Scaffold this active site. Structure first.
Site, short mmCIF file in Angstrom:
data_model
loop_
_atom_site.label_atom_id
_atom_site.label_comp_id
_atom_site.label_asym_id
_atom_site.label_seq_id
_atom_site.Cartn_x
_atom_site.Cartn_y
_atom_site.Cartn_z
N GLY A 55 2.31 5.92 10.29
CA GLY A 55 3.73 5.88 9.99
C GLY A 55 4.43 4.60 10.45
CG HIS A 77 -0.61 0.18 2.51
ND1 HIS A 77 -0.21 1.41 3.02
CD2 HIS A 77 -0.58 -0.73 3.50
CE1 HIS A 77 0.09 1.19 4.29
NE2 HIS A 77 -0.11 -0.08 4.63
CB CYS A 79 2.49 0.85 7.44
SG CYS A 79 0.83 1.40 7.93
#
Ligand SMILES: O=C1N(c2cncc3ccccc23)CCC[C@]12CCOc1ccc(Cl)cc12
Ligand SMILES: O=C1N(c2cncc3ccccc23)CCC[C@]12CCOc1ccc(Cl)cc12
Ligand SMILES: [Cl-]
Ligand SMILES: [Cl-]
Lengths: 302, 297
Positions: B135, B41, B137
């Site tokens: 932030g 993503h 991820c």
């Protein structure tokens, strides 16, 4: 979202863990630059743990009595000195993995991470708080002496604790990195007992703010309190007195959530009187006191 | 003495954390050998979006050094960014997919920098109750065995209840989740029974015996009671796994099950176990043995 008991990443400290052997005793050392720090009781024999004269025992030692092992490499001890309850072993190699560091002495209620080690090897990392009775509720077996407590500030490791002793209640006592014990403890096998422990009030309040920030509001009420009335109630539940410093420290959390400190104090008073009634706050049925106001801000905002 | 929620030492994983920026999205990547793994993503038809990207669109930063991306491929929900430099800090590692009830350490990162480490369990509903902000991820979950890091989780998203969802390092989600903004909800969760029992053994080893009773139970009667309290079924495998703890404490697994049955039907009654008023289920039988014996890495 979410609130976890979080330790600092341990890598910077792992690269400093060494094994220190003196005679039959084997414990952990902290290798920073060309010095290995470790508890001075590494020099103690069986006949001298009740009343050891460390100055006398150390004068009888030579550099080659101290076997220091960093990984699979033996370091050469070229000097030794004592600073309070810590032994400083000067070695012939500076640790290449030495991080930016400071030695800091902390106050009760402050939190830190512990890198538990055995034989100079890290086995785990957990979060601790210095209890108001100056003990820590650690997870330490025999061989963990010399394991350190720390915080990280950007790229700087602040070493705040070195493990030395387990008391009869299963709690732990140790020193700052200058060898000064936290609390009225001595590195002797004489009868020692942890004082009656109390709850770290400012930390419970910070954790209630963390719960509000995370969406939990069930414990909030329409009441406020005076600081003195709150302390009169708090003392009866074995809670530490809340000082004006604590109220001031809670200021940013109070501004962020819109709940005045004395307003949150009235919630805490209610929780102490009622209990939780089958409910939880941040996945806990007890009031958590090992998150400081600084930890809550760091974990919730960044 | 003492029982703490303990994570594995994070050093071996810290040396693998890098920052990956693609357009406006900045998250974390795992740099192992000459490949950086991160959630896809960071770039929806992910095959269509990825074909429009070039190597120079992905900005990868390892500390204060920019790595050059020389290739990119997708494997399920993970993006694999081939780089020119092999990570010198690459440890002995494996990619392992874990089962619900298994625990692991999470190294929470922001901007490629590790900020914290915590221990958690893969819930039976395939979510993790983590602590993640925007932030985080690409932050990873791992276990250590001797000198080998088993990477088992990579963070992708937060569900509306504040719980977290992610993939193994092969990009396969744990749970029925998709990496897209749509209606997703964590299913009803259950308690990891074998882990509660292991934690009761840890309490016994630490001196806490108040919950012990003279009774025993059949595995079937315990399972009938457990099902009523949203507890996972206890299998013969679980009983077998609890064997060493049963031998060490002298308390048969079905004997400890009878303690758990009474704790479920009656509560703690103002008492605590290992400083907890709730039954803890995020310590596996292996974690209890590892901590109550001091295994090192
Ligand atoms: O506490 C001690 N040890 C331990 C330290 N941490 C966890 C322990 C868990 C179980 C068993 C021992 C543990 C190991 C070193 C010696 C000792 C033994 C008791 O007498 C003293 C007195 C003072 C001092 Cl500084 C140390 C000790
Ligand atoms: O969950 C997501 N994020 C977050 C991830 N972890 C903790 C978060 C804490 C607060 C805020 C956002 C968080 C990062 C941004 C992408 C996002 C946003 C919601 O829509 C989706 C849908 C699917 C996926 Cl795979 C990711 C997301
Ligand atoms: Cl302090
Ligand atoms: Cl086992």
């Amino acid at each position: 979202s979410g609130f976890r008991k979080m330790a600092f990443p341990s890598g910077k400290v792992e690269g400093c863990m060494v094994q220190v052997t003196c005679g039959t005793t084997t414990l952990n050392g902290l290798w920073l630059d060309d010095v290995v720090y470790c508890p001075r009781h590494v020099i103690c024999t069986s006949e001298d743990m009740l009343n050891p004269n460390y100055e006398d025992l150390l004068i009888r030692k030579s550099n080659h009595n101290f076997l220091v092992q960093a990984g699979n490499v033996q370091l050469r001890v070229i000097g030794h000195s004592m600073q309070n309850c810590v032994l400083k072993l000067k070695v012939d190699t500076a640790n290449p993995k030495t991080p930016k560091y400071k030695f800091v002495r902390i106050q009760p209620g402050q939190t830190f991470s512990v890198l538990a080690c055995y034989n100079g090897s890290p086995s785990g990392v957990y979060q601790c708080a210095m209890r108001p009775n100056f003990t820590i509720k650690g997870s330490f077996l025999n061989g963990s002496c010399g394991s350190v407590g720390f915080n990280i500030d950007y790229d700087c490791v602040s070493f705040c604790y070195m493990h030395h002793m387990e008391l009869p209640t299963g709690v732990h006592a140790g020193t700052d990195l200058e060898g000064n014990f936290y609390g009225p403890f001595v590195d002797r096998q004489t009868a020692q007992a942890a004082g009656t422990d109390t709850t770290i009030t400012v930390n419970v309040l910070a954790w209630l703010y963390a719960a509000v920030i995370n969406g939990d509001r069930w414990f909030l009420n329409r009441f406020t309190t005076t600081l003195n009335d709150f302390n009169l109630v708090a003392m009866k539940y074995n809670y530490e007195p809340l000082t004006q410093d604590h109220v001031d420290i809670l200021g940013p959390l109070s501004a962020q959530t819109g709940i005045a400190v004395l307003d949150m104090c009235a919630s805490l008073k209610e929780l102490l009187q009622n209990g939780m009634n089958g409910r939880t706050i941040l996945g806990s049925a007890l009031l958590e006191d090992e998150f400081t106001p600084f930890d809550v801000v760091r974990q919730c905002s960044g």
